[PDB]
Nucleic acid binder design. Sequence first.
RNA 1: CGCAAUGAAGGUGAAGGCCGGCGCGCUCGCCGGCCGAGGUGGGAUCCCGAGGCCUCUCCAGUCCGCCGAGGGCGCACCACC
RNA 2: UAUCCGGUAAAGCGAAUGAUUAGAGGUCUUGGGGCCGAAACGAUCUCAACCUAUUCUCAAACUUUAAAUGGGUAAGAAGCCCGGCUCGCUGGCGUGAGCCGGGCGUGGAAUGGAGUGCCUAGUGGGCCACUUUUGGUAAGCAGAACUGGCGCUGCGGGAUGAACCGAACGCCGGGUUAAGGCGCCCGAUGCCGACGCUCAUCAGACCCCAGAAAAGGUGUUGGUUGAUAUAGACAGCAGGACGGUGGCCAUGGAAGUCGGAAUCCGCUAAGGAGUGUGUAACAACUCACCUGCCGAAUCAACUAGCCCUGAAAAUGGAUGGCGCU
RNA 3: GAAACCUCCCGUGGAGCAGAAGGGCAAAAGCUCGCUUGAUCUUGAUUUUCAGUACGAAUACAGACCGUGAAAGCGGGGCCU
RNA 4: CGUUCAUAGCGACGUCGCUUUUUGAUCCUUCGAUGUCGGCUCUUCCUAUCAUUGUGAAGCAGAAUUCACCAAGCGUUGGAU
RNA 5: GUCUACGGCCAUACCACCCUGAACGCGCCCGAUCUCGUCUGAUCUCGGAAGCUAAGCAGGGUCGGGCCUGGUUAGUACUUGGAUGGGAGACCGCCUGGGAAUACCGGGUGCUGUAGGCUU
Lengths: 159, 187, 168, 75, 175
Amino acid sequence: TNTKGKRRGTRYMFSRPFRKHGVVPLATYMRIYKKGDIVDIKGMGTVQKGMPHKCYHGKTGRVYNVTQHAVGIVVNKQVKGKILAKRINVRIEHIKHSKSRDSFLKRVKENDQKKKEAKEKGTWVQLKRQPAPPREAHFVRTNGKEPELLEPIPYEFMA
Amino acid sequence: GVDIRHNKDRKVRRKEPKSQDIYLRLLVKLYRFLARRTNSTFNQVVLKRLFMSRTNRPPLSLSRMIRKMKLPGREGKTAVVVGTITDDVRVQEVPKLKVCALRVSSRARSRILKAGGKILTFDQLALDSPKGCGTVLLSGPRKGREVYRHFGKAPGTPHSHTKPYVRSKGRKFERARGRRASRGYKN
Amino acid sequence: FYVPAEPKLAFVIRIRGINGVSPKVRKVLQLLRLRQIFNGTFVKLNKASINMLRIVEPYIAWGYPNLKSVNELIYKRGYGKINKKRIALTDNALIARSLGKYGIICMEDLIHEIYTVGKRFKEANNFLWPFKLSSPRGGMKKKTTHFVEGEDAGNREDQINRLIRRMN
Amino acid sequence: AKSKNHTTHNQSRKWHRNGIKKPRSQRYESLKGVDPKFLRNMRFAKKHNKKGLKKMQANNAKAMAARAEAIKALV
Amino acid sequence: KASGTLREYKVVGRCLPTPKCRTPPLYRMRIFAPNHVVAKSRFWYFVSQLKKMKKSSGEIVYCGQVFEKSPLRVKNFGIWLRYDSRSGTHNMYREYRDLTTAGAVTQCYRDMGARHRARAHSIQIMKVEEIAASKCRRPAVKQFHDSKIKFPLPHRVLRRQHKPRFTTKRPNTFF
RNA sequence: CGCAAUGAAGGUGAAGGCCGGCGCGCUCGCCGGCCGAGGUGGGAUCCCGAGGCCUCUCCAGUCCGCCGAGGGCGCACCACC
RNA sequence: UAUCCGGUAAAGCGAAUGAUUAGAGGUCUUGGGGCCGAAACGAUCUCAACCUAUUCUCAAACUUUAAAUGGGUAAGAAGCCCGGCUCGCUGGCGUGAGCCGGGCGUGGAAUGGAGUGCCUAGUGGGCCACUUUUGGUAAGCAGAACUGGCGCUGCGGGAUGAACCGAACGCCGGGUUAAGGCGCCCGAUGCCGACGCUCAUCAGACCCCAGAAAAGGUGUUGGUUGAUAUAGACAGCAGGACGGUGGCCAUGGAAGUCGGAAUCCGCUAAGGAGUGUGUAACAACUCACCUGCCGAAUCAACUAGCCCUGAAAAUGGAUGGCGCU
RNA sequence: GAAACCUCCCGUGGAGCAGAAGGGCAAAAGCUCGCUUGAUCUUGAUUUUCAGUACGAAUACAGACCGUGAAAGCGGGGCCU
RNA sequence: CGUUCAUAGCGACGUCGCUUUUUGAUCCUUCGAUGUCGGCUCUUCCUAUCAUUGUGAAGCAGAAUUCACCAAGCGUUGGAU
RNA sequence: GUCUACGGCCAUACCACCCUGAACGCGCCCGAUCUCGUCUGAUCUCGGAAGCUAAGCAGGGUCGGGCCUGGUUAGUACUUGGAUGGGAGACCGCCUGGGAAUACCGGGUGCUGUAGGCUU
Ligand SMILES: [Mg+2]
Ligand SMILES: [Mg+2]
Ligand SMILES: [Mg+2]
Ligand SMILES: [Mg+2]
Ligand SMILES: [Mg+2]
Ligand SMILES: [Mg+2]
Ligand SMILES: [Mg+2]
Ligand SMILES: [Mg+2]
Ligand SMILES: [Mg+2]
Ligand SMILES: [Mg+2]
Ligand SMILES: [Mg+2]
Ligand SMILES: [Mg+2]
Ligand SMILES: [Mg+2]
Ligand SMILES: [Mg+2]
Ligand SMILES: [Mg+2]
Ligand SMILES: [Mg+2]
Ligand SMILES: [Mg+2]
Ligand SMILES: [Mg+2]
Ligand SMILES: [Mg+2]
């Protein structure tokens, strides 16, 4: 039976990468989280105040509270049969903005551009995405030179 | 062999009322017919409620029926209640109402009729309006029963406010180890 | 060279039973509506769809149906989903009633929507109740192994039409 | 008479009989556990919204009149 | 792979074009298989080994059956192999005598199963080349190279053993 | 038993708003009038309803529906303040 | 489709940590032992550790790298975009939050009716298989992971059988299949089935499965690599096998011959400073190069198929049986 | 003198940080000084074990009263487990 | 090693097996009981052959012999503790 | 072209040695009355401005080390899913999709924000 200790098994998780030890460079601290920012948690060894628990590393969630130098952040943690949305108080250093949402906002902005225009025109445009369709009919010109023959090569033992 | 779970294939809703009383069952015969032959969903809702339990059709107090008709616009209408209409002693001035109910208590009956109110039975409502037109369908507060105060996240489970089943309240019936901070802990 | 278009649409037959089947497979098999053994569905192809077929490979035989295949399946075993009651497409009054809000007003329209994979494919294809085909007359080769390697499972592209005829 | 000591064998199955439901998201979640100094100040702000009502109502009527003038100019 | 009687297939394919490589080179093969379906698969297997190129990364351009151009000539075919033993992987040069390449490769696949209990999936055919009377190294072939060939069919054992299941006559095997 | 709680107890015990005036409107204290169980989101259901859709003719034209875009009062119940 | 998380497989050790082989190079250091030195970083070796490039081989409790499978989020009306009010928070002005009031609709694929509350029994001995996996020589042993079974469950196949494969059962007719089969037992090959392989005085004969290995075999069949030979070979028989030379080390005797460093020339047609026999040691014998005869292929070394040796148990016996070439 | 003290050079930490090991750490989290008692008083929220009960341990705040620093700040015990 | 000579007989360092007449592992069966050691008595099987029949080997001259093959037909005893 | 002050990302920015630096800067530099601090005006603090780019600093250089980025290694190693595939086992081959890491060989060797100079 294994030890219940808080930091058990974070030998690798909380360990600054190769040649990225030392001073926590300052952008990290000086970037602003509001309420409802989508934020991915990633514990860090240098800063031990406000560390998240090893279960929430990797996990993404939303900011609910913002204190002086930390951010309350609702994240969903599964427990055997039940997913528990729960609220944890991570110090900034263990947290980035999750880009996952921004590619969405880019698309909605692009849609609002393509909805305003193409209204006065009349031609309705494809706003929905569509999965990669089968690759269409097309010609391939074997331009002058014929195809290159590939015989499989005879075995030989190298070692 | 087919893969479906047969687990929630049978829907558990009622079909008829569980009661055997004959007057209610006549209302059911009437409102089944209307339900099916009219387009009115009022009839369907009413029909649905005739099958429900006592618990499930709670009493509608006179004051609650007043204030719900005091609301702006539903004026010169009829209030309908598959439950019973009870009095409120803590209301005084009773406007002249139109009412449907399976029951109205003797006080509540007097007060309404003294006001110039009309009381209707459900057979009478149908002839008056078979498609439920110009009705206010109310309901009593379902979660009135003291029952519900024991339901939920259990007592002694942090941030629950759930009445425990206790023989008698008093200084020395619970309120020790697990409510005081002084005694063990608290939730 | 003329490399013709990669196919739009494919018929997918469930070719093994409903015992001891992994949960990820099982879920996809009930996202293709392939619950019983020897049920089949049309399926429009694309990166999403094709990969779902990749996750259920040794549980299905599938490929690119002929024109005739789409007719024979629709006429001989064409059943509507009409108020959730599997009902046989005995008249166009059934198809129209359901799919006529799309311009699809007859068996023929339906066949054209399925085969060309039109705008309104999703709605015509879902309208069709999944095709309960019989066992494969003349038998199979091997249930458990892939087509390429002698068996019946997996993509057999053109050759799904032979299988269709011996089952439909 | 030693036992089996621990397992997780039939458990995933057991969990997925009844789903593994995602935690039911509402709009309007509580302000439980929000930095107290904030909550005081948003409470006070909420207290005095009725102060500065008469100004606000007039501003919307002026806006509504400007909308009605704009729609008349369009038509 | 399994079998029946194979057909030569020509299969040419290319790693599909990109921004960086706009008109990529075509690669052709000789892929013997019972049908185009497994032909194309077999094409991809051989190319994967040789070239950084997968079925996802490429497109088959032209798969097509190839017909023996002299069916009604009897030929001698040299065929070079690459099989897998129970032990290590090997090379051979087999020789068959047949009316076709397909027939000659089919013939090979049966021999290898017989003589080496080698199953299809183990064998790689590299080259199949028709060959003169000379340049035939195997004497099992060489004995049929002769103008006035002459042999009898000596102990001509009967079939139709169950047309008359029972009969009076003891049979005959001299002809 | 229920219709009142809460405190170990001495005990205490579920209303608020608005308007006008008087005290310095001091987001505090006192005097007159009006409303009277707050508000947000969702809510079965009712309510209003542009507008169709025809009538054996060209228009007029009350009656009856059918649908109804749009907009409202919003039970119960839930979440939030 | 975007976007984060990871330190297992692999890989690496001319990158850290630890392990570890070899020689090059280096009075690095210095030594301990030498030999030639009185002694001398003098000359010459040496072994110690250290170092300069290299080099061999490793890691559950090492790692610069770094997969596959995998875990989060996100993919819109609870969303966007305007206008204005509230704050005892924050502040050069501004933030940030909370309120009102308008303005805008399908925002990846596939599927499916959802939500929600109360009472609640039995259970809390488990076992089995794929794959992963710890202890152990191993176990029908013990212990985890993952899915699926059996338990709760019949049916076709596997002769027999919890658990293998196929498939999951209302009561019946017709059809068709699966996995398995089709000499007879026993439904179906009573095909003019196709091509090979293999004879066993222990033949062989189908997932789980109920049985064999190293190592052998001109048994037979395929390969692979090298030869050889008309300058007529290859075997099969017949003729010589010497001298410089008791060569040198070794004496205990080795003039070819217990052993070992050597190891070339002459005559040459050609014979090794010698394969053996044997001798105290010789001798004597025996083992190339070439012919004479005969008359086309010959021969070597690997390799992998079947077959065989390897292969011993107790009541009489089991490819299921009969049998089968 | 191989080791005392002084001085110059190189030194990515190969040292040290009470203790096991792992992580973390260089104008520090090490060492040496100066001043100190935030190891003080008081509400709730949260995390970790979890049944998502307790205990312990921790995280973010908030209100007091202080410490220290030119200050920004940091500090309500021991860099983190 | 066997004067000489790897293999008549042997056989190191290594290696591959069979066996269940040793002992361990293990705990599947039996705790509403399967009588727990030895000896006597009696039958039957196995061969991994001591003798006996037929044979190959030798470092077999004879005699004595060990090594191996077919082989379990027939035997394998009397006593002291 | 380039610098100084405060920077962001933190080696394409590090290290070694070599060369070149106009003007403005930045420095070294000259002093200890006062501020401040040392065993020591070396550092620290302070008041200067005679010299000089020697050094720091910048820019460049090196078949340089290092780092960064491509190729190769290699569809190799590994691997999701499959079979009544093989094999006495150990292990291996196929199907289905995913797919690395050295050695070796190329190329690159800071970009840039705000405020202020100089080259008028
Ligand atoms: Mg059931
Ligand atoms: Mg299977
Ligand atoms: Mg247990
Ligand atoms: Mg690990
Ligand atoms: Mg490894
Ligand atoms: Mg029990
Ligand atoms: Mg056990
Ligand atoms: Mg049981
Ligand atoms: Mg199965
Ligand atoms: Mg400390
Ligand atoms: Mg404080
Ligand atoms: Mg000897
Ligand atoms: Mg035992
Ligand atoms: Mg007995
Ligand atoms: Mg014997
Ligand atoms: Mg000075
Ligand atoms: Mg300078
Ligand atoms: Mg200079
Ligand atoms: Mg370089």
